[PDB]
Design a binder for this molecule. Structure first.
Ligand SMILES: Nc1nc2[nH]c(SCCc3ccc(S(N)(=O)=O)cc3)nc2c(=O)[nH]1
Ligand SMILES: Nc1nc2[nH]c(SCCc3ccc(S(N)(=O)=O)cc3)nc2c(=O)[nH]1
Lengths: 273, 264
């Protein structure tokens, strides 16, 4: 499995670490400093995000998101070789990001915004499709599923079809179950436990559990006390064949991923189920 | 519903347990460290540490008794935690059981003269660990047959199968490649229907892979624990108790949401 963007490629034979770079409030200088630290710790992708999608988050104007994101993507692409994912839902941010060197469109809304689908297609870039029930304002009010795995699985079927009809080929797509995006604790763990079953689509799998409440509520610790839990989640995912792990704590995750790599390379079938 | 019995209590092996490592004036600090490990969530304390590492200075019978017995006694009197004892000597096995030890953890699988008979007499649970530039045809198959052999040897000496734990012995006569081969296939050892104990914490199988110092292996050690626990390993022996317990809670939440209750 490989992805292609901006005249390079990304080999998904071994799990990759994606470092989180939030640029919600010198801002540009600190951002590039942080990216650099994450690159040196072994991150091969940086996820640049200028809109909070935490539960209850307020929307951000397109002009504000552009000012936060585009100088940061540009500065990174002009200095390093690391891949760059842009965590946005806005057509214009999608276009302007691709023009300045971004490689992956990581949309938590799966291109649901008006014109987002068409803009993503126009770039040619890889696209991550994430599951969310509802929207960030209300997704955590009362998450409810008869069968969460089935409903997330059905959602991916539907959204894959949707991207194909718009002219985005399967080979550009990634899937992400959306941990924390309209799920209670038990819903998140049902998805993590059956994650390997999403491989049937034959598409890269991306997960983002780092420091989220599925660790906090389970351990009864705050956000700065969740490293061990976060690593445990990362390893559980990567052992089931997840290709990209989105994290805050890059060095430590990269170390854990080596151990997973060694273990999978010693295994016959190269996955746990 | 696997359980072990010792000293009038039981250990419920339906979820993974963290066994903290204790290094053996002494006694006050030992009880202090035991207390910290219990507070961090260890349910078993392994008594020995640096004093009992392979390569360490061999000691006389009377020295090992003087060093080990009062620590086991003091822990048994003050806490409800289970106590694993690191020893190869029959006298120490015997006297440890008298003062409250729950598990005999002999890396030599009771090979020294009298050790097997002394272990049998105590009625306590016994860990069967595999030990030996290393070399194997099929390291899994060699470890497997070693277990078949020790189970029969123990059963010969009157030790019920219900008291045995199996440990593949990470880092004992094994290069990096052999170690990862055993971890990768750890789940296959469940055919014995016996508890599985593993100890990878801070070992060379991490140190060599990541190329870092003894004190910088927490993340790889946690990865190892999680990999083992996801395959149904019952006891994980570690230095970093708090962090390992947190990781094990995540594994337990994952395994409770799974139909199989194990990854293979
Ligand atoms: N592909 C992908 N992209 C992502 N972007 C984000 S931003 C996280 C917003 C947030 C924070 C905290 C909680 S909570 N209540 O669970 O702790 C939920 C959402 N996440 C993901 C993710 O997973 N995948
Ligand atoms: N049941 C059980 N008991 C144990 N006791 C020990 S003591 C540690 C000795 C050591 C240190 C370092 C390396 S190395 N060269 O791989 O880094 C090997 C052995 N370990 C274990 C274990 O695993 N199980």
């Amino acid at each position: 499995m490989k992805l292609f963007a901006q005249g390079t490629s990304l080999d998904l034979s071994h799990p990759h670490v994606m470092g989180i770079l939030n640029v919600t409030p010198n801002s540009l200088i600190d951002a590039v400093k942080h990216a650099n630290l994450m690159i040196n710790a072994g991150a091969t992708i940086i996820d640049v995000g200028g809109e909070s999608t935490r539960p209850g988050a307020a929307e951000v104007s397109v002009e504000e998101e552009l000012q936060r994101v585009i100088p940061v993507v540009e500065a990174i692409a002009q200095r390093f070789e690391v891949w760059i994912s842009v965590d946005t839902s806005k057509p214009e941010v999608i276009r302007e990001s691709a023009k300045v060197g971004a490689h992956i469109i990581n949309d938590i809304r799966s291109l649901s915004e008006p014109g987002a689908l068409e803009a993503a297609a126009e770039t040619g870039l890889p696209v991550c499709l994430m599951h969310m029930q509802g929207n960030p304002k209300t997704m955590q009010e009362a998450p409810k599923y008869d069968d969460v795995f089935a409903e997330v699985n059905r959602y991916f079927i539907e959204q894959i079809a949707r991207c194909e009809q718009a002219g985005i080929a399967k080979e550009k797509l990634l899937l992400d179950p959306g941990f924390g995006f309209g799920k209670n604790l038990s819903h998140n763990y049902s998805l993590l436990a059956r994650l390997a079953e999403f491989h049937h689509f034959n598409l890269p799998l991306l997960v983002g559990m780092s420091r989220k409440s599925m660790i906090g509520q389970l351990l009864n610790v705050g956000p700065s006390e969740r490293l061990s839990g976060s690593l445990a989640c990362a390893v559980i995912a990567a052992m089931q064949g997840a290709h990209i792990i989105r994290v805050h704590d890059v060095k430590e995750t990269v170390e854990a991923m080596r151990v997973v790599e060694a273990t999978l390379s010693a295994k016959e079938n190269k996955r746990y189920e």
